[PDB]
Amino acid sequence: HMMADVETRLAELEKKVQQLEDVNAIRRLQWAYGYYIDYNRPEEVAGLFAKDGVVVFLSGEYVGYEGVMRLYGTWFQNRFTGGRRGPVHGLLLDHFQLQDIITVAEDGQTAKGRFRGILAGGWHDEVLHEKPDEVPQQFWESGLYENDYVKEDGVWKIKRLDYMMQWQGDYETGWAHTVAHLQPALVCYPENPDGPDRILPQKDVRQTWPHRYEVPMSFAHPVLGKAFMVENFTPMMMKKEKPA
Amino acid sequence: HMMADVETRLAELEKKVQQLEDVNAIRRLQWAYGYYIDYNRPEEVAGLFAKDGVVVFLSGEYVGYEGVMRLYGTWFQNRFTGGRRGPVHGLLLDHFQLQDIITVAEDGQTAKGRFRGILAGGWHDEVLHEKPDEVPQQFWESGLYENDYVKEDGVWKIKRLDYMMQWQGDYETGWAHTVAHLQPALVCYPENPDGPDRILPQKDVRQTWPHRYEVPMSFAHPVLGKAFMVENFTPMMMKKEKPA
Amino acid sequence: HMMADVETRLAELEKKVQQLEDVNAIRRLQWAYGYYIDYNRPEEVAGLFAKDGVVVFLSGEYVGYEGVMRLYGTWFQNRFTGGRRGPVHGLLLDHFQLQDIITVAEDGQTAKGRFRGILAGGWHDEVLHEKPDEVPQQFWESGLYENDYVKEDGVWKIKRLDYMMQWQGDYETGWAHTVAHLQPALVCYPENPDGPDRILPQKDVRQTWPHRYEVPMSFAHPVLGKAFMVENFTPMMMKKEKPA
Numbered sequence: 083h084m085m086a087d088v089e090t091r092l093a094e095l096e097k098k099v100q101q102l103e104d105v106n107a108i109r110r111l112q113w114a115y116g117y118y119i120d121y122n123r124p125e126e127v128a129g130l131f132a133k134d135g136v137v138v139f140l141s142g143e144y145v146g147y148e149g150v151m152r153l154y155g156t157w158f159q160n161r162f163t164g165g166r167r168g169p170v171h172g173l174l175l176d177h178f179q180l181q182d183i184i185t186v187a188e189d190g191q192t193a194k195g196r197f198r199g200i201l202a203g204g205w206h207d208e209v210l211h212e213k214p215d216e217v218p219q220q221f222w223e224s225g226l227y228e229n230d231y232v233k234e235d236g237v238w239k240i241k242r243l244d245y246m247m248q249w250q251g252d253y254e255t256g257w258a259h260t261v262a263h264l265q266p267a268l269v270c271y272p273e274n275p276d277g278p279d280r281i282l283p284q285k286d287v288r289q290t291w292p293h294r295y296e297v298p299m300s301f302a303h304p305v306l307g308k309a310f311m312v313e314n315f316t317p318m319m320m321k322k323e324k325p326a
Numbered sequence: 327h328m329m330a331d332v333e334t335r336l337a338e339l340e341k342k343v344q345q346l347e348d349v350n351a352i353r354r355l356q357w358a359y360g361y362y363i364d365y366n367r368p369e370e371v372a373g374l375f376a377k378d379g380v381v382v383f384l385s386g387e388y389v390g391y392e393g394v395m396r397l398y399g400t401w402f403q404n405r406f407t408g409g410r411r412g413p414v415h416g417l418l419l420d421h422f423q424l425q426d427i428i429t430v431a432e433d434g435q436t437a438k439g440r441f442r443g444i445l446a447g448g449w450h451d452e453v454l455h456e457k458p459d460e461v462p463q464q465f466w467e468s469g470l471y472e473n474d475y476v477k478e479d480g481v482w483k484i485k486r487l488d489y490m491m492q493w494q495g496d497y498e499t500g501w502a503h504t505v506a507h508l509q510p511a512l513v514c515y516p517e518n519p520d521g522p523d524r525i526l527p528q529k530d531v532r533q534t535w536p537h538r539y540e541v542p543m544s545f546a547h548p549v550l551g552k553a554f555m556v557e558n559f560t561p562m563m564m565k566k567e568k569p570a
Numbered sequence: 571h572m573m574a575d576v577e578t579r580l581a582e583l584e585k586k587v588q589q590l591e592d593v594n595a596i597r598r599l600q601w602a603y604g605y606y607i608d609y610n611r612p613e614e615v616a617g618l619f620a621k622d623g624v625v626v627f628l629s630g631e632y633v634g635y636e637g638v639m640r641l642y643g644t645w646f647q648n649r650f651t652g653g654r655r656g657p658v659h660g661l662l663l664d665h666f667q668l669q670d671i672i673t674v675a676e677d678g679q680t681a682k683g684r685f686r687g688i689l690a691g692g693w694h695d696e697v698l699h700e701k702p703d704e705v706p707q708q709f710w711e712s713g714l715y716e717n718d719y720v721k722e723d724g725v726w727k728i729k730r731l732d733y734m735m736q737w738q739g740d741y742e743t744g745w746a747h748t749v750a751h752l753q754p755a756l757v758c759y760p761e762n763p764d765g766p767d768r769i770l771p772q773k774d775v776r777q778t779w780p781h782r783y784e785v786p787m788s789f790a791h792p793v794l795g796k797a798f799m800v801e802n803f804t805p806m807m808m809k810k811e812k813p814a
C-alpha cells in the first residue's frame with residue numbers, strides 16, 4: 083500500500099545515489115592516476131589496477147601488476163628520472179587530466195570512461211645531461227583515453243587503461259613542425275625489456291602524429307542516443323570547392 | 327505522523343538527487359560537445375541543441391539545426407578539413423574543456439553553466455597546403471562559455487551556446503605578439519554564406535584580442551551570495567602609484 | 571520493524587546525498603576562485619575565505635580578509651592591472667583549473683582538496699609599458715593546491731588555500747630554459763608591503779623551479795588505501811644503469 087510505494091522510492095534513490103557515487107569514484111581513479119604518473123611513482127599506478135588489468139600504450143598490451151610496473155617503471159621511470167620516485171630536480175612531467183565522460187553499466191559492476199591529458203614534459207638545462215638521446219628536451223603532448231573499470235569487493239579498479247597519444251610538439255617548434263618521437267610497438271617483452279606482453283592485432287595498431295585515427299566515443303549521443311544519424315544533418319551544410 | 331515525515335524526507339532526497347543528476351547531465355553535454363568539435367563532426371553538435379537552440383560566435387547568432395550546421399559545418403569543417411568528418415591526417419583542433427560551474431533553476435527545467443576551453447590548433451607541415459590564407463599554421467586559443475540549457479521530454483539540451491573567444495596566440499610568437507585573426511560578425515547569412523542569422527545588438531558586440539570585456543558570472547558568489555559587495559573589501563588593499 | 575529499516579535507509583541516503591553535494595560545493599569554490607583571480611578581482615576572492623582563513627603563497631601565510639586582499643590586491647592586482655578590477659585591455663591571466671580530488675571529513679564539517687592550475691599569463695605589446703621590470707612579458711606557469719575547507723553556518727568556505735607553484739616557462743624559451751622569477755618569501759608585512767603575516771617554518775619552505783619538492787597527496791590510495799605499500803611493487807621493475 084503506502085509501504086510498497088516507500089520501498090520502491092527508497093530502492094530507486096539507492097540505485098541513483100549508487101551511480102552518482104560510482105561516477106565520482108571512477109573519476110577519482112583517473113585523477114589519482116594522473117598525480118602518480120606526474121611524480122614517476124609506478125607502484126601507486128600498478129595498485130590502481132585489477133590483478134588481470136591491462137594498460138595499452140603505443141598499440142601494446144602490458145598485463146597485470148608486472149606489466150604496469152614494466153611500462154611505468156622499467157621504461158618510463160628510467161627514461162625520465164633514472165629510476166627514482168619523483169618529483170626530482172629540473173624534471174617536468176605534468177599530465178593535465180580533464181574532460182571525463184563516464185558511463186556506468188546498468189548492473190553497477192563495470193564502467194567505461196573517456197578522458198584526455200595534455201602533457202608538459204621536459205628536462206631543465208640543469209639536468210639536460212640526464213635526458214636520453216631520442217627525446218626532445220621539452221615538449222607538449224596530448225592523448226585520449228578510453229578506459230574500462232571493474233568493481234571488485236566494493237572497490238572501483240582500472241580493468242583497461244588505453245592511452246592513445248594523438249600529438250606531440252617540441253616546445254621550440256610546436257605540433258605543426260614535429261613528428262611523434264614514439265612509434266607503435268614492434269617487439270614484445272621479454273626480447274624488448276620495455277616491450278608489451280602482446281601487440282594489438284594489426285587492424286587496431288595506430289601510426290602516430292602526424293597520422294590521425296578516430297578513437298570511437300564510449301558514450302551514446304547524449305541528446306538523441308542510438309537514434310542519432312549523421313545523414314539526418316549533413317544535408318544542412320554546404321561542402322565548399324576548397325577550405326576558406 | 328511517522329509517514330508524513332517519511333514522505334517529506336523521500337521528496338527532499340528525490341529533489342536533491344534529481345539536481346545532482348542534472349549537473350552531471352549538463353556537464354556531459356559540454357564535454358561531449360568538445361569531443362565532437364575536436365573531430366569536425368558538426369552533425370553530432372547540431373543534435374545536442376533544442377530545435378529553437380542558438381549558438382553565438384563572434385557576436386553572431388546561428389539559429390536551430392540549420393544555423394548550427396552552417397557554423398560548425400559550412401564554415402568550420404570546410405576551413406579545417408575541407409568538408410570531411412574528422413579526425414584527418416595532420417589536422418589538430420583539440421579544444422580542452424574545463425572549469426564547469428553549473429546553476430540549475432529551482433524548477434529543474436532550465437540551467438546555466440559557465441565553462442572554458444583552451445584550443446591547440448593547426449596544420450602539420452604535411453597538410454599545410456590545405457590551410458586557408460587568413461589562418462595561422464598553428465595557434466593557441468582560449469574562450470569562455472556562458473550557456474543556457476533546457477530540459478525537454480526528460481532530456482537536457484543546449485538552448486544557447488555562447489562562445490566568447492578571449493585570446494589567440496600564434497604558436498611561434500604567443501598571445502603577447504598576436505592580434506586575433508577573427509573579428510566580430512559584420513554580414514549575416516545568406517549574403518555571407520558563413521554568417522549568422524542575426525548580429526547581437528551593438529551594446530553586446532565584442533571586439534577581439536587584444537580587446538577584453540568582462541563575461542559576467544552566471545553564478546552568485548558561492549559564500550556570501552547576493553550579499554557580496556565589492557566595496558566591503560576594496561578598502562583593505564593599497565592601490566600603488568605604478569605596477570610593481 | 572519495517573519502520574526501523576525505512577529510518578536506517580533514509581538516514582544512510584541523507585548522509586550520502588549530503589557528501590555528494592559537499593563535493594560539488596567544494597569544487598565550485600575552487601572553480602569560482604579561478605574565474606575571480608583571472609579577472610584580478612581580489613574582493614570576490616577574499617569573500618570565499620572563512621574570517622580566520624589563510625592563503626599560502628611562496629611559503630608565506632596571509633591571514634584573513636586583510637591578508638587575502640594584500641596578496642590578491644596590494645601585490646597581484648597592482649602588478650598585473652595597476653590596481654584595476656579586470657579584465658583589462660591586453661592583459662591575460664588565465665589560470666586553467668582542473669583535476670580536483672576532494673576528501674570530505676566523516677563528520678561533514680571539514681574537507682581537503684587537491685587541485686591544479688596551468689596559467690597562461692602576459693601583457694600584449696599594446697600594454698607592455700605597464701609591465702613591471704622583474705616579470706616576463708608572457709609565460710606559462712603551473713601549480714598544485716592542497717587546500718582545507720570548513721563548513722560554517724551551512725556554507726562551504728576556504729579555510730586554507732595553499733598554492734605551491736611548480737614551474738614557470740617564458741613563452742619564448744619554455745620551462746626547460748626558464749628559472750622561476752618568484753622565490754620563497756623573505757620579508758613579512760608590514761616591512762614588506764606585499765609580504766605575508768608569517769613565513770612557514772624552514773622545514774616547510776620551498777625553493778622554486780628548477781627545484782622540485784613533493785606535495786604529499788591529501789587522498790589515500792583509492793584502491794588499496796592505507797594498505798598500499800611501495801615495497802610490494804618496486805621489485806617488479808628493473809632500475810637501469812642509465813636513462814633510455
Ligand SMILES: COc1cc([C@@H](O)[C@@H](CO)c2ccc(O)c(OC)c2)ccc1O
Pocket residue numbers: 119137138139157158161175177199201217223225245247263264
Ligand atoms: C600510458 O600512460 C601514459 C603515457 C604517456 C606517454 O606518451 C608519455 C608518458 O609521459 C611519454 C611521452 C614521451 C616519451 O618519450 C615517453 O617515453 C616512453 C613517454 C602519457 C600519458 C599517459 O597516461
Ligand SMILES: COc1cc([C@@H](O)[C@@H](CO)c2ccc(O)c(OC)c2)ccc1O
Pocket residue numbers: 363381382383401402405419421443445461467469489491507508
Ligand atoms: C562556437 O564554438 C567554438 C568555436 C571556436 C572557434 O573560435 C575556433 C573553432 O575551432 C576557431 C579558431 C580559429 C579560427 O580561424 C576559426 O575559424 C572560423 C575558428 C572554439 C571553440 C568553440 O566551442
Ligand SMILES: COc1cc([C@@H](O)[C@@H](CO)c2ccc(O)c(OC)c2)ccc1O
Pocket residue numbers: 607625626627645646649663665687689705711713733735751752
Ligand atoms: C595564490 O594564488 C595563486 C597565485 C599564482 C601566482 O604564482 C601567479 C598569480 O597569477 C603569479 C605569477 C607570476 C608572477 O610574477 C606573480 O607575481 C606576484 C604571480 C597563481 C595561481 C594562484 O592560485
